[PDB]
mmCIF file with all atom_site columns, N, CA, C and O in Angstrom:
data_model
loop_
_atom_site.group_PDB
_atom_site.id
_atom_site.type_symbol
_atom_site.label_atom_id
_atom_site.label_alt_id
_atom_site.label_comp_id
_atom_site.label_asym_id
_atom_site.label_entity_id
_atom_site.label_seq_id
_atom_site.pdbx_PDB_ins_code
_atom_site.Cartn_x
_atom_site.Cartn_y
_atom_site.Cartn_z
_atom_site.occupancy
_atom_site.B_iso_or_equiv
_atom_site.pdbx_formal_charge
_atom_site.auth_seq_id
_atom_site.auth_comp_id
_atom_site.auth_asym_id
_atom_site.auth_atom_id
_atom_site.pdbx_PDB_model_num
ATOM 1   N N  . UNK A 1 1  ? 0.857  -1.195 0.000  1.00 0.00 ? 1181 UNK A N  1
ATOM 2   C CA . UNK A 1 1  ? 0.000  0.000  0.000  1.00 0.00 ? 1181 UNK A CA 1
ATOM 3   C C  . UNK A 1 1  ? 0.876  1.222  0.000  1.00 0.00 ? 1181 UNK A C  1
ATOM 4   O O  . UNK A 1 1  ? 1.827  1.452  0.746  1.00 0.00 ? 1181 UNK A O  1
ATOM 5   N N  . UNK A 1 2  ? 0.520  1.763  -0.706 1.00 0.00 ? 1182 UNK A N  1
ATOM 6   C CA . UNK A 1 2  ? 1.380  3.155  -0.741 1.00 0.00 ? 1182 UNK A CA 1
ATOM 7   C C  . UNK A 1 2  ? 2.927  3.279  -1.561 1.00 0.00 ? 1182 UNK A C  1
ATOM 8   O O  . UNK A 1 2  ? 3.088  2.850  -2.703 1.00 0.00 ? 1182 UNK A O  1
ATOM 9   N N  . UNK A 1 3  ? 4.090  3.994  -0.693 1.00 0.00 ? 1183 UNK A N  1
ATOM 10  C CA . UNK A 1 3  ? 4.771  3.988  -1.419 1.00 0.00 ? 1183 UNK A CA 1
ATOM 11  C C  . UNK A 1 3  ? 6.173  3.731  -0.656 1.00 0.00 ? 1183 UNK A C  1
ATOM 12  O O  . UNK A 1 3  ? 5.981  4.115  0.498  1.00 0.00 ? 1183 UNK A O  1
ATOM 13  N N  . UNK A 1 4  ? 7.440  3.274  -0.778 1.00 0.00 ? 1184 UNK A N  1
ATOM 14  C CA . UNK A 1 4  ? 8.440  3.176  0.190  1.00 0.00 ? 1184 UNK A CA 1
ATOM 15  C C  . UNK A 1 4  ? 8.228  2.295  1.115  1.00 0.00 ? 1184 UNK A C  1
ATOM 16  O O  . UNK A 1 4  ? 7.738  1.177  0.953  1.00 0.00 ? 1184 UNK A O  1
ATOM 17  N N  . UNK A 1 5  ? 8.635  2.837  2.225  1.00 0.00 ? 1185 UNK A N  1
ATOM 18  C CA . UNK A 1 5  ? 8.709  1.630  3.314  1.00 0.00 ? 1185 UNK A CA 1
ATOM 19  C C  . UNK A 1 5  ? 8.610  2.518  4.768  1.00 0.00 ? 1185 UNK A C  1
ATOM 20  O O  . UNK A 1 5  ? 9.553  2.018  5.382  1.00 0.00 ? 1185 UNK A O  1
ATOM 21  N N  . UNK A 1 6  ? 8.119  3.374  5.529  1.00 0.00 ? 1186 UNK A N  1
ATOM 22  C CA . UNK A 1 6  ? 7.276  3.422  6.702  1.00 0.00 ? 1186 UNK A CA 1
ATOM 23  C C  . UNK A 1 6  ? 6.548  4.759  6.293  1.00 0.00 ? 1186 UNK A C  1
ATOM 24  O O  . UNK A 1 6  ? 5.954  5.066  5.260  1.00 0.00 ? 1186 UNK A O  1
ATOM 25  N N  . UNK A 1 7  ? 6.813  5.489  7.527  1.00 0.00 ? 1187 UNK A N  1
ATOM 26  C CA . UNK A 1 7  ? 6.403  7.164  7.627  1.00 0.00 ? 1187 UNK A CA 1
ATOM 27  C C  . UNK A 1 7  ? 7.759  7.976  7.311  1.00 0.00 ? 1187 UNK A C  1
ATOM 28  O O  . UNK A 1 7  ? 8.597  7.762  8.187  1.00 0.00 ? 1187 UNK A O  1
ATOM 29  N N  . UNK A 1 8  ? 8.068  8.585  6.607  1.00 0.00 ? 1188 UNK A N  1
ATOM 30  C CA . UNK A 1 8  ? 9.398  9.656  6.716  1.00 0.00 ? 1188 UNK A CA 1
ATOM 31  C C  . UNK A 1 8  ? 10.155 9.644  5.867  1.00 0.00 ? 1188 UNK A C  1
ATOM 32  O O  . UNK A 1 8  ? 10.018 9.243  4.711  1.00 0.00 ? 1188 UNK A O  1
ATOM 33  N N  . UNK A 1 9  ? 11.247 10.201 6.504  1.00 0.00 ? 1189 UNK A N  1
ATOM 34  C CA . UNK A 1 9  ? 12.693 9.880  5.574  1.00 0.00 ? 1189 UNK A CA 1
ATOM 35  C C  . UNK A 1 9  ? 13.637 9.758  6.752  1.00 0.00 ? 1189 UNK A C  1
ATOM 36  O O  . UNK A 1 9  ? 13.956 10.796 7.332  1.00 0.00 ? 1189 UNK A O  1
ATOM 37  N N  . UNK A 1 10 ? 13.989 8.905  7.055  1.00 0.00 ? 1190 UNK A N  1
ATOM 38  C CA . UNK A 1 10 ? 15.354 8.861  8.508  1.00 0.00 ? 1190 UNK A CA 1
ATOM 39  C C  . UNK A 1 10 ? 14.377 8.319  9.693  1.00 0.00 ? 1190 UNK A C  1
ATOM 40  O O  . UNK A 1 10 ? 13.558 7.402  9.620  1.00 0.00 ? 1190 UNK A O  1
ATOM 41  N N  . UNK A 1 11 ? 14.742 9.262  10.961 1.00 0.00 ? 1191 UNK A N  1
ATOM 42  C CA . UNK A 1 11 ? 14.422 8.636  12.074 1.00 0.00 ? 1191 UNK A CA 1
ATOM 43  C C  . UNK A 1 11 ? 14.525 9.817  12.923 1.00 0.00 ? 1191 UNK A C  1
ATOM 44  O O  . UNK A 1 11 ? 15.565 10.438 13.141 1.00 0.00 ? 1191 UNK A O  1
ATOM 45  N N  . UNK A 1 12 ? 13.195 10.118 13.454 1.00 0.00 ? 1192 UNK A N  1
ATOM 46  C CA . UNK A 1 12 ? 13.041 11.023 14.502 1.00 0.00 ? 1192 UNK A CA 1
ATOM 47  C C  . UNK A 1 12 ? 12.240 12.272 14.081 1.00 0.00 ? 1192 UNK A C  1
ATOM 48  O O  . UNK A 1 12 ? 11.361 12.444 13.236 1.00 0.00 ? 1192 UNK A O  1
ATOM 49  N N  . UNK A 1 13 ? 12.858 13.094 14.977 1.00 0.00 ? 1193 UNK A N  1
ATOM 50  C CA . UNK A 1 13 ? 12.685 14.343 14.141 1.00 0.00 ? 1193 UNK A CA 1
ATOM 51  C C  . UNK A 1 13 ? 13.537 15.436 14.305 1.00 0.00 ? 1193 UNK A C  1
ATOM 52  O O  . UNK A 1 13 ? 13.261 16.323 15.112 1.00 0.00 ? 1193 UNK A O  1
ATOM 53  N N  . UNK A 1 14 ? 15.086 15.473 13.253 1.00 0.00 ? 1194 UNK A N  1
ATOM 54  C CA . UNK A 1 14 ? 16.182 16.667 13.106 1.00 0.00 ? 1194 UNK A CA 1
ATOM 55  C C  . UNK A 1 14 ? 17.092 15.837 12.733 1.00 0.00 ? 1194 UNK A C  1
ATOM 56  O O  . UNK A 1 14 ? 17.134 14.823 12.035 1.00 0.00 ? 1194 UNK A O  1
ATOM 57  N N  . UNK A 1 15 ? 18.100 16.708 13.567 1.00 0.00 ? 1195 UNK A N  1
ATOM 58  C CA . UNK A 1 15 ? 19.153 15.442 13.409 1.00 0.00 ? 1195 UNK A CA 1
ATOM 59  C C  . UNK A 1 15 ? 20.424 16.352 14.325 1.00 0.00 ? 1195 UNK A C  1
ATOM 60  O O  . UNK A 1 15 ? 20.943 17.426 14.023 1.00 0.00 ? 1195 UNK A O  1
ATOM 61  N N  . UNK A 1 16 ? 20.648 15.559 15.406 1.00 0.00 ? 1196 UNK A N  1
ATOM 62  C CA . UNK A 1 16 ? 21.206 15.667 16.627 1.00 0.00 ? 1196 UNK A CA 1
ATOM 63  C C  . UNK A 1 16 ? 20.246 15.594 18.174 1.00 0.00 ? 1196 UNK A C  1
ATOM 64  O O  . UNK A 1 16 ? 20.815 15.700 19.260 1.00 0.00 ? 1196 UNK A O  1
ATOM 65  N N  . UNK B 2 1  ? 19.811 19.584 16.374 1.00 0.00 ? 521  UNK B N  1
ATOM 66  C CA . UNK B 2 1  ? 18.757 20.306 16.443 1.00 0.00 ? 521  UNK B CA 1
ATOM 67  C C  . UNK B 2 1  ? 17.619 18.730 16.369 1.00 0.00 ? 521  UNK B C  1
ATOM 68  O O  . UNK B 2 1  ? 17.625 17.773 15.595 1.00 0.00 ? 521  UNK B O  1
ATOM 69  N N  . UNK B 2 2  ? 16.825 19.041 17.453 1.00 0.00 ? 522  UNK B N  1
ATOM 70  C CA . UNK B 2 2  ? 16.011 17.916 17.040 1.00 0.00 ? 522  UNK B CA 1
ATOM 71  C C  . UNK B 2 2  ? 16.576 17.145 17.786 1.00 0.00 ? 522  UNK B C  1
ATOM 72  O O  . UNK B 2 2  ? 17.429 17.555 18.573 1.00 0.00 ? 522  UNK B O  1
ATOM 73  N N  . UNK B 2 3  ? 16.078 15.312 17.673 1.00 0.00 ? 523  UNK B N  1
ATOM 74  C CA . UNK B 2 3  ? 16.567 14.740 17.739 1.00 0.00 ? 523  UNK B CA 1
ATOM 75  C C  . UNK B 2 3  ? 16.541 13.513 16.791 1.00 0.00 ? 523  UNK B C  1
ATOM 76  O O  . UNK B 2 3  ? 15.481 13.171 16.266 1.00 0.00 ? 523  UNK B O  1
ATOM 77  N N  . UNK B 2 4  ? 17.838 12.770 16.544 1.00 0.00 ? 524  UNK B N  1
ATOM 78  C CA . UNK B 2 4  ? 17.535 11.641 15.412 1.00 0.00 ? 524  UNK B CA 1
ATOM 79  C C  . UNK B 2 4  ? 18.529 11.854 14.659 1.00 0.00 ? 524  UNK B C  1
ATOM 80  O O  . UNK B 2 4  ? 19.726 12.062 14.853 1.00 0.00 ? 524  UNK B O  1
ATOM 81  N N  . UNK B 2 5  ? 17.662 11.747 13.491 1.00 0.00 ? 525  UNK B N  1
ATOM 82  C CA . UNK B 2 5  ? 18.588 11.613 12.086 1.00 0.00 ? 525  UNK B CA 1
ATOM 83  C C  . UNK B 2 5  ? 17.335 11.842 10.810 1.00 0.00 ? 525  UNK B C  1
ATOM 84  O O  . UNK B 2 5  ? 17.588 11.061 9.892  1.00 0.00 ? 525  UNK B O  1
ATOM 85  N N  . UNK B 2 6  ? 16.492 12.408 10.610 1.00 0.00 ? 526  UNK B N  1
ATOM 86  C CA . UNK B 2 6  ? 15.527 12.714 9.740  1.00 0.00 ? 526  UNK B CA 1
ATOM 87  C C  . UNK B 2 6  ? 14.253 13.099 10.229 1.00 0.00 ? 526  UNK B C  1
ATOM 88  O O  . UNK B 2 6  ? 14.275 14.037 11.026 1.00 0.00 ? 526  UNK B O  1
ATOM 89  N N  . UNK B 2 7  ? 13.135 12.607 9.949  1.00 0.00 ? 527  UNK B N  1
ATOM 90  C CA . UNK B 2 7  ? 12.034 12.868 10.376 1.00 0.00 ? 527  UNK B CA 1
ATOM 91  C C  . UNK B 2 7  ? 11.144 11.274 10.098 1.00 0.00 ? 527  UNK B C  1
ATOM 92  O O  . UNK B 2 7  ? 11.000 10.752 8.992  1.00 0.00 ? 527  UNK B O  1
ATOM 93  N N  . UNK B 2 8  ? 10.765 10.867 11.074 1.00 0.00 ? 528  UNK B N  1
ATOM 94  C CA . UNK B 2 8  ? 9.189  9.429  11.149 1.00 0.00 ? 528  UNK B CA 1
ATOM 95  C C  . UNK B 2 8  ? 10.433 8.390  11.713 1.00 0.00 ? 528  UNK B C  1
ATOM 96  O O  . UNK B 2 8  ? 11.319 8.288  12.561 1.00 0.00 ? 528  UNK B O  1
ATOM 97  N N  . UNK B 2 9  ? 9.732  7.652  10.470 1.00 0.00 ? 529  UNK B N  1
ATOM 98  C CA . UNK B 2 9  ? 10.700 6.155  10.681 1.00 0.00 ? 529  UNK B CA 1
ATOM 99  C C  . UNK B 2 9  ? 10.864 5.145  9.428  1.00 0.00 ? 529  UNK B C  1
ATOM 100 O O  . UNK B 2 9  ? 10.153 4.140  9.414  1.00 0.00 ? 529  UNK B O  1
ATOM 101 N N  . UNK B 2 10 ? 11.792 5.385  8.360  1.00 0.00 ? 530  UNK B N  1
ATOM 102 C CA . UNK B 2 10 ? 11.745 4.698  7.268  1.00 0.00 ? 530  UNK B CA 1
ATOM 103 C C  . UNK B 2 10 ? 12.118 5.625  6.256  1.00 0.00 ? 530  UNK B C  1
ATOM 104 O O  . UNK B 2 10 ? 12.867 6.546  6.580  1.00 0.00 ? 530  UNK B O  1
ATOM 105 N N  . UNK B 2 11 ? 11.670 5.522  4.946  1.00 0.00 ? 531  UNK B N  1
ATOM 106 C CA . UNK B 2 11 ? 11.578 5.902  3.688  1.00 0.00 ? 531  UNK B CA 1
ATOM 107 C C  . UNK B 2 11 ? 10.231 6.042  2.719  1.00 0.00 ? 531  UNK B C  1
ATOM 108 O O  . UNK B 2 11 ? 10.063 5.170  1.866  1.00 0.00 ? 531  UNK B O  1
ATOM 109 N N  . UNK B 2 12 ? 9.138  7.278  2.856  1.00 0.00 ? 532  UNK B N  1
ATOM 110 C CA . UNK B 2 12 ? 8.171  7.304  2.425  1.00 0.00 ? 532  UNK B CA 1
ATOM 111 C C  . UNK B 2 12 ? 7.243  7.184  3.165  1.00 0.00 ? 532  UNK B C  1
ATOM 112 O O  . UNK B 2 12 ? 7.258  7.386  4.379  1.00 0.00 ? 532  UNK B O  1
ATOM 113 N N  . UNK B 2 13 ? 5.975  6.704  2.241  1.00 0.00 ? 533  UNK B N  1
ATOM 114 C CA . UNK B 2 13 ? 4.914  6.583  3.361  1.00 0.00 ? 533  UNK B CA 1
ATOM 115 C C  . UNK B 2 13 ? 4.148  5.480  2.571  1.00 0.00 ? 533  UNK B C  1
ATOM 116 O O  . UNK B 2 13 ? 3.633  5.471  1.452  1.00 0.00 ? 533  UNK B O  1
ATOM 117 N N  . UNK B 2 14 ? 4.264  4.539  3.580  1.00 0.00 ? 534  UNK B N  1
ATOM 118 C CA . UNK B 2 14 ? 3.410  3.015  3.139  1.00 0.00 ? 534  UNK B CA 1
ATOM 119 C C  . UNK B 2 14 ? 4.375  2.121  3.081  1.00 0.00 ? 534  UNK B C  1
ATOM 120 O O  . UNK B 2 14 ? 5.582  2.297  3.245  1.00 0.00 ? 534  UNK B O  1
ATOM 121 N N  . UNK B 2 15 ? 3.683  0.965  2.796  1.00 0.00 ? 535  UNK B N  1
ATOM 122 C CA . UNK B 2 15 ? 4.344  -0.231 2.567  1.00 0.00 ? 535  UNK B CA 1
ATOM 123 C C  . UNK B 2 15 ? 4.421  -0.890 1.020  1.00 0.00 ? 535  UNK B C  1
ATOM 124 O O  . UNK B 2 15 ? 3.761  -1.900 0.776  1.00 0.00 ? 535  UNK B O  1
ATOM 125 N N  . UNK B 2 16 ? 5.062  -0.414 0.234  1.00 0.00 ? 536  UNK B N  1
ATOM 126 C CA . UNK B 2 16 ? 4.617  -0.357 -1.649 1.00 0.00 ? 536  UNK B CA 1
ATOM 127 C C  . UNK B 2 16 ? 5.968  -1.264 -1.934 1.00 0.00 ? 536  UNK B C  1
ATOM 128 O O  . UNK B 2 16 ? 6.259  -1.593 -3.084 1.00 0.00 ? 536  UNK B O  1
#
């Protein structure tokens, strides 16, 4: 269903 | 800034 593979792009939310 | 490494969890949205 849909497209890719979960919610997002990466993990979290930012980066640090 | 943030925390993580992107934003959600994965690549996209769904399971395709």
């Amino acid at each position: 269903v849909g497209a890719x593979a979960x919610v997002x792009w990466x993990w979290x939310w930012x980066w640090x």
